[PDB]
Amino acid sequence: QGLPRVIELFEARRPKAKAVISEIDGVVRIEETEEKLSVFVESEGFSKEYKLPKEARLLVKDGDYVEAGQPLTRGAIDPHQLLEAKGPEAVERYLVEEIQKVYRAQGVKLHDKHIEIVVRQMMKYVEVTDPGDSRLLEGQVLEKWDVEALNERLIAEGKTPVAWKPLL
């Protein structure tokens, strides 16, 4: 729960006690009883519906704001799920925060920059969704995808912008 938690944060490994994840937004509206809690949020066209073990706390009844990657089963959020849940920008703000929190506990205090560098490095690669020159499902650096679009649009005529998917 000290150094190990830090490891789990930098290694992006699956959290110790997973606590599910939220996908879409709308008004928080969860069910009540049943083994499978029959959540039903809202928004436009969508809804909600999950499935976790018995022991779990919610912290939010039917009323307010659900958003993406919120307290569901209250605990260690999965960075991998949160990446597709909220986006690359949010993850960078999450990891650094909890990492630094751990160091804050044991009285040693380092600037956030140092952490921010590493966490930025854990987000350089992205997996291919749409092919045009190389293959899909391919691990690749984001900045390398910069020249793809930049050169094919500003200098070339190949209007097949390959869609990349953020990869943690």
From Swiss-Prot:
Family: Belongs to the RNA polymerase beta' chain family.
Taxonomic lineage of the native organism: Bacteria, Thermotogati, Deinococcota, Deinococci, Thermales
Record-given protein name: DNA-directed RNA polymerase subunit beta'
Quaternary organization: The RNAP catalytic core consists of 2 alpha, 1 beta, 1 beta' and 1 omega subunit. When a sigma factor is associated with the core the holoenzyme is formed, which can initiate transcription.
Disulfide bonds: none
Function of the protein: DNA-dependent RNA polymerase catalyzes the transcription of DNA into RNA using the four ribonucleoside triphosphates as substrates.
